[PDB]
């Protein structure tokens, strides 16, 4: 399983890299004169160092549409992170549970769909940032990374279907 | 829609006379109103002719009323007033007013002293000295812009927003195909075959 | 930004294509083949994808979407043809904030002596 | 005078060619009519 | 032999089966892309 052992390596190390990316808070410096080292949770400023959380998107028990869309820009971060983390939870899930039948394959599917919602998260994020030019590389990291892990352990999943199902079926062609 | 929007656009006082969609007026009493009335200048003449018979009344009682009319007309009403007071208003919350174009006439404030006074020449020179030292300009900046509350309030790009809504909803389609196909594959097939043996 | 938007459009379309395509055999056989073409050819003005009809919605809504696009940037241009009319250094502060455009005054006169003696922020840097 | 003024209109005409929907569609129904009447008639 | 002409032609005007090698693939999407930009262009020029 040298190819596929390496696939696992890419899987887990991919995952750790993923969440390190998520922390990558450097999403830009936006220098206003300040300069703004602006994380996911808060946005931090710079000369004199300053920081601030989300200003608004963030309150007012209002209803209907565009208001609820402000509520969205609040929620949109909470669309971003959890899906990614869950994908990871999978990733380890078939890191160890590779050995032992279906859940392997079943899981792995659920793994990489969870992995899939990530770029969605991103787009969400950027257009939140399109509430109102520089950027940060953490984005790019994440975006590519999901693609990677996804491809890798999915192609694995194929190898499960093939080996298990077809190859062992043929093993039963006796 | 595209150029119709993009082809859209405004000059100076002459722009107020060339159009009628946007109403405009001055204070019901003061040098501002009396200016247009007595003005024999081409542009300002037409302007007065309009305001003189414009209905409803385009003139306001006080300066506060005029500003309020501009803030509540969604850009359908313009107010003519002294540049000094105007520039100041632009630096006041909610920062929803702005001065456009140059002044219509040349005026000026000065220090008044009784005819044949002793302070007469001294003060005169003092004013000239202050202006040359840039002290006058400094003072104005101190009370108009520096002490102002509005330094917060280009390039005409694409529509990305609405487009982006399309992205997301589009994604709803994505994940929809995703789960439905998933449970139908594994559950439909694996269900049946599971029940086979 | 939008270019990246359409990029990740490609990426998601493509992969998912293979995913629906995954009979595992036929599935993958149709996934590998077509995915690229769609996430590409389909990008520019739009041979035969169909199976799952769960992949249908992806394909049509694609053709739709890319179609909207091509219309969009196209007419976007035609406007750029019409409008985009030449435009411009607004204030003095703009001359100090940049260096690409050089600037100066008369070698002798009140104009030059003004900046030299001026203690104002902007005019200081200019001098 | 009060008239020295006499272009924000932006819209979509559903109507205009919607008529051509109509005619097109009558074409549809008849098309299938002729279809199954020759299919049925000649075939059977 | 089969396809080349069709592409360098049909593909020219608003864009049947190229696919095999993936070699020609990239080049064809290049094509559709390319000519597509074009036709778009002359049309915008038109309306102008």
From Swiss-Prot, chain A:
Record keywords: Calcium, Calcium channel, Calcium transport, Glycoprotein, Ion channel, Ion transport, Membrane, Phosphoprotein, Synapse, Synaptosome, Transmembrane, Transmembrane helix, Transport, Voltage-gated channel
Main location: membrane
Topology term for the membrane: Multi-pass membrane protein
One GO CC term on file: voltage-gated calcium channel complex
Location(s) in or outside the cell: Membrane; Synapse, Synaptosome
Gene Ontology MF, one: voltage-gated calcium channel activity
Any one of the GO BP annotations: positive regulation of synaptic transmission, glutamatergic
TM annotation in the entry: 5-25, 78-98, 104-124, 141-161
Keyword Phosphoprotein appears in the UniProt entry: yes
UniProt record similarity statement: Belongs to the PMP-22/EMP/MP20 family. CACNG subfamily.
Oligomer and partners: The L-type calcium channel is composed of five subunits: alpha-1, alpha-2/delta, beta and gamma. Interacts with the PDZ domains of DLG4/PSD-95 and DLG1/SAP97. May interact with GOPC. Acts as an auxiliary subunit for AMPA-selective glutamate receptors (AMPARs). Found in a complex with GRIA1, GRIA2, GRIA3, GRIA4, CNIH2, CNIH3, CACNG3, CACNG4, CACNG5, CACNG7 and CACNG8. Interacts with GRIA1 and GRIA2. Interacts with MPP2.
Function: Regulates the trafficking and gating properties of AMPA-selective glutamate receptors (AMPARs). Promotes their targeting to the cell membrane and synapses and modulates their gating properties by slowing their rates of activation, deactivation and desensitization. Does not show subunit-specific AMPA receptor regulation and regulates all AMPAR subunits. Thought to stabilize the calcium channel in an inactivated (closed) state.
Annotated protein name in UniProt: Voltage-dependent calcium channel gamma-2 subunit
Species in which this protein is naturally found: Rattus norvegicus
Span within the parent record: 6 to 215 of 323
From Swiss-Prot, chain D:
Induction: Down-regulated in the pyramidal cell layer of CA1 in the hippocampus by global ischemia.
Lipidation (S-palmitoyl cysteine): 40
The record's account of how the chain is modified after translation: Palmitoylated. Depalmitoylated upon L-glutamate stimulation. In contrast, Cys-40 palmitoylation does not affect cell surface expression but regulates stimulation-dependent endocytosis. Ubiquitinated by RNF167, leading to its degradation.
Annotated localization: Cell membrane; Postsynaptic cell membrane; Postsynaptic density membrane
Residue spans crossing the bilayer: 17-37
Expression sites by tissue: Detected in forebrain. Detected in dendrites of neuronal cells. Expressed in the pyramidal cell layers of CA1 and CA3 and in the granule cell layer of the dentate gyrus.
Family under the similarity heading: Belongs to the glutamate-gated ion channel (TC 1.A.10.1) family. GRIA2 subfamily.
Subunit and partners: Homotetramer or heterotetramer of pore-forming glutamate receptor subunits. Tetramers may be formed by the dimerization of dimers. May interact with MPP4. Forms a ternary complex with GRIP1 and CSPG4. Interacts with ATAD1 in an ATP-dependent manner. ATAD1-catalyzed ATP hydrolysis disrupts binding to ATAD1 and to GRIP1 and leads to AMPAR complex disassembly. Interacts with GRIP2. Interacts with GRIP1. Interacts with NSF via its C-terminus. Interacts with CACNG2, PICK1 and GRIP2. Interacts with GRIA1 and SYNDIG1. Part of a complex containing GRIA2, NSF and NAPA and/or NAPB.
Functional note: Ionotropic glutamate receptor that functions as a ligand-gated cation channel, gated by L-glutamate and glutamatergic agonists such as alpha-amino-3-hydroxy-5-methyl-4-isoxazolepropionic acid (AMPA), quisqualic acid, and kainic acid. L-glutamate acts as an excitatory neurotransmitter at many synapses in the central nervous system and plays an important role in fast excitatory synaptic transmission.
Full protein name: Glutamate receptor 2
From Swiss-Prot, chain E:
Localization per record: Cell membrane; Postsynaptic cell membrane; Postsynaptic density membrane
Induction data: Down-regulated in the pyramidal cell layer of CA1 in the hippocampus by global ischemia.
Protein name, as recorded: Glutamate receptor 2
Reported function: Ionotropic glutamate receptor that functions as a ligand-gated cation channel, gated by L-glutamate and glutamatergic agonists such as alpha-amino-3-hydroxy-5-methyl-4-isoxazolepropionic acid (AMPA), quisqualic acid, and kainic acid. L-glutamate acts as an excitatory neurotransmitter at many synapses in the central nervous system and plays an important role in fast excitatory synaptic transmission.
Organism superkingdom: Eukaryota
Protein's organism: Rattus norvegicus (Rat)
Membrane-spanning ranges: 22-42
Coiled coil: none
Residues of the full protein shown: 594 to 643 of 883
Domain notes: The M4 transmembrane segment mediates tetramerization and is required for cell surface expression.
Intramembrane segments: 1-14
Ranges per topology, Cytoplasmic: 16-21
More details: The postsynaptic actions of L-glutamate are mediated by a variety of receptors that are named according to their selective agonists. This receptor binds AMPA (quisqualate) > L-glutamate > kainate.
Tissue specificity annotation: Detected in forebrain. Detected in dendrites of neuronal cells. Expressed in the pyramidal cell layers of CA1 and CA3 and in the granule cell layer of the dentate gyrus.
Protein family according to the UniProt entry: Belongs to the glutamate-gated ion channel (TC 1.A.10.1) family. GRIA2 subfamily.
PTM characteristics: Palmitoylated. Depalmitoylated upon L-glutamate stimulation.
